[PDB]
């Protein structure tokens, strides 16, 4: 997903270890006759993802099926 949004073809793609809560990722990219390995950093940014926000606004489910039957003993 990150390599796809980089903005030559490429030989390989692997990534280094940045730290669990340190909002950053770093990744390395190897790319007719010249081979070149260079490294890139990605700032991670936090926000909301609509469905979750929708959970706090009461009307979460957004379609209901109310099945029913008038009998005391339902077979």
């Amino acid at each position: 997903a990150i390599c796809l949004r980089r903005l030559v073809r490429l030989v390989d793609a692997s990534f280094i270890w940045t730290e669990p809560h340190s909002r950053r990722i770093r990744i390395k990219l190897t790319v007719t006759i010249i081979q070149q390995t260079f490294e890139v950093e990605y700032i991670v940014i936090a926000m909301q993802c609509p469905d979750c926000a929708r959970s706090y606004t009461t009307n979460t489910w957004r379609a209901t099926v109310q099945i029913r039957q008038k009998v005391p003993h339902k077979r």
Binding site: S55, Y56, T58, T60
Partner: protein, 211 residues
């Protein structure tokens, strides 16, 4: 999941404990309440220090959890992990509700959210018993437990002996004679009333007048 602690701060609603009507409630964040050297005799740890609340408030179950770790973590590293006995007096029983959801208020009663305490002015939250020399570590240990709570609380040096209901000299008056004996964690005292047959079985040092 968690709302801010400013919302469920003050004692508004009635006591709403777990029972056959509420039934479903989440597990408490705090689990073990006694820490340090909790298989220790009464003569070992005389000097007692409290952490006293100065506000009628609710302390949530995760406010005590973060407070209990930081007080223990400082006291374990500095003075050693068997130089004290920390006791968290406060148990969280009160269940908080949240209205997590045809219309808005057209049918509105909330689900259970979490457990919290109900603390009162002058109530003891943390109680620590220690040696005479190891005071300053206990005072500075409870200082960092204070930042994790809301409101106002204060530290007090107790005049009593350990966890006993007795003063410094009054315990020493009765312990010299055969009037006190060890229970296990706490302690047992002699009684003038009761059967005289089993007042002689236990307390063998009393009834002698010699040594």
């Amino acid at each position: 999941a968690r709302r801010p602690a400013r919302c469920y701060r003050y004692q508004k609603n009635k006591p709403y404990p777990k029972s056959r009507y509420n039934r479903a409630v989440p597990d408490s964040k705090i689990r073990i309440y006694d820490l340090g050297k909790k298989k220790a005799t009464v003569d070992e740890f005389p000097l007692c220090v409290h952490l006293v609340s100065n506000e009628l408030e609710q302390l949530s179950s995760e406010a005590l959890e973060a407070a209990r770790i930081c007080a223990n973590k400082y006291m374990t590293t500095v003075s050693g992990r068997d130089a004290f006995h920390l006791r968290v007096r406060v148990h969280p029983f009160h269940v908080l509700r949240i209205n997590k959801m045809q219309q808005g208020m057209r049918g509105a009663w909330g689900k259970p959210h979490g457990l919290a305490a109900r603390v009162d002015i002058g109530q003891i939250i943390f109680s620590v018993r220690t040696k005479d020399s190891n005071k300053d570590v206990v005072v500075e240990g409870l200082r960092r437990a204070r930042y994790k709570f809301p409101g106002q609380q204060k530290i007090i040096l107790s005049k009593k002996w350990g966890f006993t209901n007795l003063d410094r000299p009054e315990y020493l008056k009765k312990r010299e004679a055969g009037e006190v004996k060890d229970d296990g964690a706490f302690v047992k005292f002699l009684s003038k009333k009761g059967s005289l047959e089993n007042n002689i079985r236990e307390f063998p040092e009393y009834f002698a007048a010699q040594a």
